Amino acid sequence: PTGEVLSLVGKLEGTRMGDKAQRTKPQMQEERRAKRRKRDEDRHDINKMKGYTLLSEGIDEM
Amino acid sequence: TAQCFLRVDDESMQRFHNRVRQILMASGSTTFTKIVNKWNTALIGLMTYFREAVVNTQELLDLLVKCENKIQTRIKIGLNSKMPSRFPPVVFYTPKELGGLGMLSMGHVLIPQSDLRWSKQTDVGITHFRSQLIPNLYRYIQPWESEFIDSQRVWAEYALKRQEAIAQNRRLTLEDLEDSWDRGIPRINTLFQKDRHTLAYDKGWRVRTDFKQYQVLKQNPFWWTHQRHDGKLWNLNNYRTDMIQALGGVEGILEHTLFKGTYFPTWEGLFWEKASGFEESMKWKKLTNAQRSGLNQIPNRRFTLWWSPTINRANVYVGFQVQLDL
Amino acid sequence: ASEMAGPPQMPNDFLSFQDIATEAAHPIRLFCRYIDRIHIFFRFTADEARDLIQR
Amino acid sequence: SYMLPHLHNGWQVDQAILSEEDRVVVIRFGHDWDPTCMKMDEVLYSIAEKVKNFAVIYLVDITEVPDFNKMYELYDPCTVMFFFRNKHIMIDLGTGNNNKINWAMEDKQEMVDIIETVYRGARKGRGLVVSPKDYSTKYRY
Amino acid sequence: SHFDLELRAAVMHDILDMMPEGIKQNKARTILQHLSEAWRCWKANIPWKVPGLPTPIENMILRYVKAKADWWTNTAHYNRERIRRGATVDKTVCKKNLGRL
Amino acid sequence: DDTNVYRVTIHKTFEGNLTTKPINGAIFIFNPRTGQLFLKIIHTSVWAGQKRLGQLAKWKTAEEVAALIRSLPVEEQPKQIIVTRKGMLDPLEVHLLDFPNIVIKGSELQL
Amino acid sequence: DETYGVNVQFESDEEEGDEDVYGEVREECTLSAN
Amino acid sequence: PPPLLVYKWCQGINNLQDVWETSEGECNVMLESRFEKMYEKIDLTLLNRLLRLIV
Amino acid sequence: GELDMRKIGQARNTLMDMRLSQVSDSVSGQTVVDPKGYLTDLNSMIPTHGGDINDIKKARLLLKSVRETNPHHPPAWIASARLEEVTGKLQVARNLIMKGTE
């Protein structure tokens, strides 16, 4: 059994090209999820008061 | 209604062969790792451009195996001036970070059943264990037709989802479109880049990259795509992991190395110190060309010492034993 | 060239004609220039082929 | 032409070898009309003024001065030998023998490295030095 | 292969032969440098004209340069044909051929 | 304690512009056992126009404390140095290499 | 409040993988011959 | 990408109108050419005049 | 005599250029700006102050550290906003100042 590598001609019968391929997953998926969750929580105040044009809004003073 | 049969142009075949010839000739006094990196880059370029045509072409496979064998023979000649027999494939095909050359394979290499046994000694005593073919690139690369159909489908999906999101006033999150992460000729990944707004003004980028050949001396194997716009069109982490497993698991690989000699309790917290040598690697200095060549050989010295146990045996080299003095 | 490019208001995509009659109106059915390489696709009927060969 | 100085007898050869004290003496043994010696002499002429600082070159015709053939084993077309302060220096070229060159190389840059390494080893005191390259293979690809 | 070496050596011998003894002890290296300069100028495609150089020696140098240029072009083309068709070569030969081309 | 090394004063002129004046800081080196405190003054001129990032300031404070340790005799030299700021120990690890006998650590507690 | 007295830290922070910090898709005369 | 260009070319050729029908005696022709010396033979004065229209 | 080989080429070039300009005269919609007017506009537009960019970035990092260290330094927030509005754009200053106000 020499170490020579052998031509693949005639040795592809049992296999396809897309077989064994794999597609990755978003790196730090959960860390980014947590960062976005914290950002949403801390920015909830900014979002809530964003569209409230106070002069034209009568509930802001409350 | 019709069938289209594809092949790789003889001109492209000749260009790849000449690229390998240039790598070999200019190899000269260069390093094994650089030679293997050049080979990996060339093979990745060819195999990612001509995906199905390579399989369809019965001459390109033979050319690929011939060039791979030439590269391996170059490494062996550099190792020693006398050709061995049944050289082990672990040194070539082991990942770089684990001490190997991290070579990429495109042939049918059979790992002998002998190499996969490995021993381990503890207070109890010695226990012996065992674990096949090297994975090939063509399996892990995806066909162009599937790429295109899936791209059409996934981008239609994204159009629908984006319409729904504009209806809801929100932006699309990473959580949605998650199943479609790596899909689409313009990859869905590129849709989240910071510089998307800036890139929106880049036009003629494909032809510009194609023309770069008249401005930059280096040959670009990826002259047809840009990581910024088209995204990454392949993925080989699976291939690396399967290469480790086929070589026989981390312990099986380390058996051939000198790692057990270091007597490190475990292989977890260890780290290589690239380009240090005994002189701090003296990377910056006004040394002569011969001195610089010696430094460039130093990494080959480290590699040869690291893989010495599996390279320094009578099975590999016919018996002409000479005991080391003292 | 105008038939292939379509009217200025709604240009056609790479290989397509606003109407199949417009597509069939000419022997040249497809055209594509790379940086400097040209690929053309003609379709002749018997009479046009014979006349062109005669010329 | 061969404007490089030529040595005509063993007396001249030994006097030239002993004359230098801080420069490596290079001797090309061979016949000036042999094409291998022609190529070697061309390269040596090119590198003369480059390595004048620490080396001096000389040429010997084997027929003119055959006394050294037996002791130094001069039977190949062209050979190159290096001396320093009456000591014969050896070089580990990897060709199999570390005494002489015995063939013609074509790269003046590599010849310069050989001269520099031999001089440095001689000054450091080593009787044998290691060339910064292996010639066991002709590195043709 | 070494046709250029042979041609240069023959040219040197011929020019030195009739050259009077009294001044050849001094002008040999000068004429060699002149040959080198003429070859360099031809290679660079620039005029080469030494005002004080006698016309017969000028003609001799011109003939030498013409012959060497013929051999240069022919060997460059042949070596390129070899490399293109496919024949093992090395870095220095490849670089020299690239420069000539 | 190297927090107080770089401090600035923001003084307002209500019309025309605003000015920030970098003022002198202090590197504090305290001895819990004997209570001896070496406070190294950091003049404004050191960093008023240095044209450098923190890649100068961190290694500057590290080299200043290393110089103080060098000047101090070995008998009085410490073998344990605890940094209040966690982003300080690494440049110390680099700079006090000449004195491996010391142990550089961070302080989970801030004084 | 005047709050005179300020401390400033310089760090080489803000290292990221170049992706969006939050995983969100942030979207936002003629010629004539006479 | 060029592979997708090739795929689109093939699809368009196949999707032309009754392209593969050759009962009456039709004929399809694919021409491929290179535009020899495109860069080298570019008259600069004419190129300048042409550019002045667009730019 | 001799031939001034250049001349005939120059004559042919001039003939072609004159003919092409003759044709171009019919074309109307072309655009061409006045170089002196544009150069005058640029020379006028050259800024007289602004702010050295390296010093601006140093001040930006300094003020960022200031504000982050002190959540309650209205002078710091005002200084950061003033810098961000004198140089750069104003949306970032507006967001930073909403943050500082809160």
Swiss-Prot record, chain A:
There is a cross-link at K11 (Glycyl lysine isopeptide (Lys-Gly) (interchain with G-Cter in SUMO2)). Residues 15-45 are annotated as: Disordered. It is found in: Nucleus. Residues 19-49 form a coiled coil. It comes from the Eukaryota. Widely expressed. Contains two helicase domains. The N-terminal helicase domain has catalytic activity by itself, contrary to the C-terminal helicase domain that may have a regulatory role and enhance the activity of the first helicase domain. Component of a core complex containing at least PRPF8, SNRNP200, EFTUD2 and SNRNP40. Component of the U5 snRNP and U4/U6-U5 tri-snRNP complexes, building blocks of the spliceosome. Component of the U4/U6-U5 tri-snRNP complex composed of the U4, U6 and U5 snRNAs and at least PRPF3, PRPF4, PRPF6, PRPF8, PRPF31, SNRNP200, TXNL4A, SNRNP40, DDX23, CD2BP2, PPIH, SNU13, EFTUD2, SART1 and USP39. Component of precatalytic, catalytic and postcatalytic spliceosomal complexes. Component of the minor spliceosome, which splices U12-type introns. Belongs to the helicase family. SKI2 subfamily. This is U5 small nuclear ribonucleoprotein 200 kDa helicase. The gene is SNRNP200. The chain holds residues 36 to 97 of 2136 of the full protein.
Swiss-Prot record, chain B:
Residues 282-295 are annotated as: Important for branch point selection. It comes from the Eukaryota. It is found in: Nucleus; Nucleus speckle. The modification N6-acetyllysine is found at K232. Residues 80-326 are annotated as: Linker. Widely expressed. The MPN (JAB/Mov34) domain mediates interaction with TSSC4 and SNRNP200. Has structural similarity with deubiquitinating enzymes, but lacks the residues that would bind the catalytic metal ion. Contains a region with structural similarity to reverse transcriptase, presenting the classical thumb, fingers and palm architecture, but lacks enzyme activity, since the essential metal-binding residues are not conserved. Plays a role in pre-mRNA splicing as core component of precatalytic, catalytic and postcatalytic spliceosomal complexes, both of the predominant U2-type spliceosome and the minor U12-type spliceosome. Functions as a scaffold that mediates the ordered assembly of spliceosomal proteins and snRNAs. Required for the assembly of the U4/U6-U5 tri-snRNP complex, a building block of the spliceosome. Functions as a scaffold that positions spliceosomal U2, U5 and U6 snRNAs at splice sites on pre-mRNA substrates, so that splicing can occur. Interacts with both the 5' and the 3' splice site. This is Pre-mRNA-processing-splicing factor 8. It comes from Homo sapiens. The chain holds residues 1225 to 1557 of 2335 of the full protein.
UniProtKB/Swiss-Prot annotation, chain D:
The lineage of its organism: Eukaryota, Metazoa, Chordata, Craniata, Vertebrata. SMART domains: DIM1 (SM01410). The keyword Cell division applies. It comes from Homo sapiens (Human). Belongs to the DIM1 family. The disulfide bond seen in structures determined by X-ray crystallography and NMR is not essential for protein folding and function. PANTHER family: THIOREDOXIN-LIKE PROTEIN 4A, THIOREDOXIN-LIKE PROTEN 4A, 4B. Plays a role in pre-mRNA splicing as component of the U5 snRNP and U4/U6-U5 tri-snRNP complexes that are involved in spliceosome assembly, and as component of the precatalytic spliceosome (spliceosome B complex). It comes from the Eukaryota. Disulfide bonds join C37-C78. InterPro entries: Dim1, Thioredoxin-like_sf. This is Thioredoxin-like protein 4A. The gene is TXNL4A.
UniProtKB/Swiss-Prot annotation, chain H:
Widely expressed. It is found in: Nucleus; Nucleus speckle. Disulfide bonds: none annotated. It is linked to Retinitis pigmentosa 13: A retinal dystrophy belonging to the group of pigmentary retinopathies. Retinitis pigmentosa is characterized by retinal pigment deposits visible on fundus examination and primary loss of rod photoreceptor cells followed by secondary loss of cone photoreceptors. Patients typically have night vision blindness and loss of midperipheral visual field. As their condition progresses, they lose their far peripheral visual field and eventually central vision as well. Plays a role in pre-mRNA splicing as core component of precatalytic, catalytic and postcatalytic spliceosomal complexes, both of the predominant U2-type spliceosome and the minor U12-type spliceosome. Functions as a scaffold that mediates the ordered assembly of spliceosomal proteins and snRNAs. Required for the assembly of the U4/U6-U5 tri-snRNP complex, a building block of the spliceosome. Functions as a scaffold that positions spliceosomal U2, U5 and U6 snRNAs at splice sites on pre-mRNA substrates, so that splicing can occur. Interacts with both the 5' and the 3' splice site. This is Pre-mRNA-processing-splicing factor 8. It comes from Homo sapiens (Human). The gene is PRPF8. The chain holds residues 947 to 1001 of 2335 of the full protein.
